[PDB]
């Protein structure tokens, strides 16, 4: 199962790790993707997860968008996890660098509650522009299911653990 995670709360765990390498190792039931409404997996976690699937995740995502239209900011969809997980939960956190409502971050984390255990990144962190300390706070105050957070950046991981209330 998941190893080397620091326990933050009864249900939230965290590790300084590459989510692609973590997914390839564990092969979780659910890996969360930090998606945009168009499921265009260009950069950040999305670009990395998609590249690990040899672009199979983008091919599948484009078929999903052609059929269903775009997701909502704060929304999600369950697609295949490919070589990374059984499923990929594509969750759209608000992108602050696109003027999107940071209040949507709680709605985005609520999607995790539909899955008993998930491997996930901090929503709206990184290239999405939100404060990762705020994202972790929203995560532990919203998610009730078991969430194993992979934080790529070592220095950010240390700051998150050392500042966690
Ligand atoms: N496996 C990889 O190539 C990467 C992992 C990663 C992890 C988090 C965010 C962005 C990333 O981009 C590159």
UniProtKB/Swiss-Prot annotation:
Name residues in a coiled coil: none
Tree of life domain? Viruses
What is catalysed by this protein? Thiol-dependent hydrolysis of ester, thioester, amide, peptide and isopeptide bonds formed by the C-terminal Gly of ubiquitin (a 76-residue protein attached to proteins as an intracellular targeting signal)
Q: How does it sit in the membrane?
A: Multi-pass membrane protein
Subcellular localization(s) per the UniProt record: Host endoplasmic reticulum membrane
What results from changing residue 162 to L? In strain: Gamma/P.1
Please state how the activity of this protein is regulated.
Inhibited in vitro by GRL-0617.
Q: Where is the Macro domain?
A: 1-165
Quaternary arrangement and interactors, per the entry?
May form homohexamers. Interacts with N protein.
Task performed by this protein: Responsible for the cleavages located at the N-terminus of the replicase polyprotein. Participates together with nsp4 in the assembly of virally-induced cytoplasmic double-membrane vesicles necessary for viral replication. Antagonizes innate immune induction of type I interferon by blocking the phosphorylation, dimerization and subsequent nuclear translocation of host IRF3. Also prevents host NF-kappa-B signaling. In addition, PL-PRO possesses a deubiquitinating/deISGylating activity and processes both 'Lys-48'- and 'Lys-63'-linked polyubiquitin chains from cellular substrates.
Protein name listed in UniProt? Papain-like protease nsp3
Report the gene name: rep
The shown chain, on whole-protein numbering, covers 1027 to 1191 of 7096
């Amino acid at each position: 199962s998941f190893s080397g995670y620091l326990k933050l709360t009864d249900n939230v765990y965290i590790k300084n790790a590459d989510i692609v390498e973590e997914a390839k190792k564990v092969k979780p039931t659910v890996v969360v993707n930090a998606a945009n409404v168009y499921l265009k997996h260009g950069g950040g976690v999305a670009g990395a997860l998609n590249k690990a699937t040899n672009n199979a995740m983008q091919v599948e995502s484009d078929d999903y968008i052609a059929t269903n239209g775009p997701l909502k900011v704060g929304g999600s969809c369950v697609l295949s996890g490919h070589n990374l997980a059984k499923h990929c939960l594509h969750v759209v956190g608000p992108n602050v660098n696109k003027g999107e409502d940071i209040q949507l971050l709680k709605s985005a984390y609520e999607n995790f509650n539909q899955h008993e255990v998930l491997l996930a990144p901090l929503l709206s962190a990184g290239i999405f522009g939100a404060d990762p300390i705020h994202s972790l706070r929203v995560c532990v105050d919203t998610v009730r299911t078991n969430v194993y957070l992979a934080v790529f950046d070592k220095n950010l991981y240390d700051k998150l653990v050392s500042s966690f209330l």
